[PDB]
Amino acid sequence: MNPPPPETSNPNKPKRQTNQLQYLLRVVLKTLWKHQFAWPFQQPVDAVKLNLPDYYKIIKTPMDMGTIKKRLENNYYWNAQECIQDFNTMFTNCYIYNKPGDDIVLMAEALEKLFLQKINELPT
Numbered sequence: 001m002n003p004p005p006p007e008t009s010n011p012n013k014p015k016r017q018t019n020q021l022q023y024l025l026r027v028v029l030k031t032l033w034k035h036q037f038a039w040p041f042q043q044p045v046d047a048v049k050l051n052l053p054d055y056y057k058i059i060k061t062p063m064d065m066g067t068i069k070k071r072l073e074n075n076y077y078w079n080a081q082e083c084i085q086d087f088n089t090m091f092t093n094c095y096i097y098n099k100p101g102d103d104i105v106l107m108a109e110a111l112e113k114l115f116l117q118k119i120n121e122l123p124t
């Protein structure tokens with residue numbers, strides 16, 4: 001029931017190092033990563049482990065912070081907006097699959113609040 005995880009390396013994809021990407025790794029991702037509610041999001045959803053064969057029938061663009069962290073560390077992105085889009089995919093997937101007030105949604109909402117806080121002053 002688990003698809004192959006999102007790629008974290010792609011040799012023919014063009015890459016750039018920017019100050020915004022460095023901040024997304026050093027500040028934004030590490031602050032989220034340490035948060036008490038981060039653990040569900042530190043790796044792809046394991047639908048076999050969870051016995052949720054429906055998960056990847058609903059969520060067609062999966063994304064997790066373990067993938068985003070590996071992408072940042074491997075210099076996968078062209079620009080910060082591509083990374084921010086991955087974070088937003090992750091949050092949105094959580095809101096789509098689950099229902100308002102679910103524990104997992106409270107977790108995602110807390111992380112997203114912190115995320116928007118940290119990106120409120122991206123560098124230049």
Ligand SMILES: CC(C)N1c2cc(Nc3nccc(-c4cncc5ccccc45)n3)ccc2N(C)C(=O)[C@H]1C
Binds near residue numbers: 046055
């Ligand atoms: C809702 C839950 C199934 N959830 C989820 C689970 C995990 N991992 C995990 N591992 C062991 C036990 C559990 C677990 C069991 N029961 C209730 C829970 C309530 C709140 C958190 C976790 C729970 N969850 C990882 C990611 C997700 N994401 C992002 C989702 O959107 C859905 C698919």
